[PDB]
Design a protein around this ligand. Sequence first.
Ligand SMILES: CCS(=O)(=O)N1CC(CC#N)(n2cc(-c3nc(Nc4cc(F)c(C5=CCN(C)CC5)c(F)c4)nc4[nH]ccc34)cn2)C1
Length: 291
Amino acid sequence: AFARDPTQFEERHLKFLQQLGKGNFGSVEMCRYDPLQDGEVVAVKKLQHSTEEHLRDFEREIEILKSLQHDNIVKYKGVCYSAGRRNLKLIMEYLPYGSLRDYLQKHKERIDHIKLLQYTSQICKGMEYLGTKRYIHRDLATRNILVENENRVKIGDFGLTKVLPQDKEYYKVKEPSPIFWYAPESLTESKFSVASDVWSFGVVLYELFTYIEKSKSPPAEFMRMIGNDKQGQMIVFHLIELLKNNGRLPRPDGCPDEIYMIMTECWNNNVNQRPSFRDLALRVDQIRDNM
Ligand SMILES: CCS(=O)(=O)N1CC(CC#N)(n2cc(-c3nc(Nc4cc(F)c(C5=CCN(C)CC5)c(F)c4)nc4[nH]ccc34)cn2)C1
């Protein structure tokens, strides 16, 4: 059966305006839905280089997003069953300021530490909410956070999100990767969990405090530590060895020690010792409130 109402967004009234994002397997476009043919601007996600397995994953992704209703999660609006109801596209609210990764670079001169901590708090709260559904995001990064306005960000994409098995606290991926955001046990055992999302959240917090400055990204810093000339699997082997023996991204320029300490606590090789998203949201909000 049709998991969504197929009459809500009819393809003949969904008009393309602009490309917003693009990867190897998906893209997001700005469109306008004008049923009166005379409408609302929306964001539309579609597959690229689609396959039956990717379409099945996309259906799971759509079901994930439709199940989430939270101030710091982008709003699902519906599905368009295009190509004569032989294809799927996901309809979402359009967030006018784009990805946080780009916004931070464009507006770094107006964004101070307390503003970065507001962004940190909101991402944390979206992640607390995901955990209540037993969803593991698996792709937390500033490129996947969107800006609604100067005071509100939202987690914007769920293309890699998985639901935990009923009887397990981790999801084991078979055939796989943003390796420079991955927790060590994801690299060495293919295991993803709430705690590996907390590791990746530490990387997001690092990204925020770098302001996405050139040469400070996690890939650039890890490659500088590993050796820039290395290629292929040797990179992974060195990253594993580096993380297991306490190699870490550096404290960003200007970053307070207290905030670097939060990053370092998220980057614990002991999975059970990492803080929870609830711990993190309270700690960050108390820092903001005490400033
Ligand atoms: C890699 C596979 S993917 O392509 O599928 N993937 C990439 C992906 C990453 C995430 N999350 N994404 C999602 C969106 C997206 N953007 C928007 N608004 C938007 C507004 C803007 F003003 C701009 C600008 C364009 C020109 N600039 C110079 C300035 C800012 C913009 F870029 C986006 N609203 C949305 N609602 C739901 C999704 C969504 C965008 N990228 C999901």
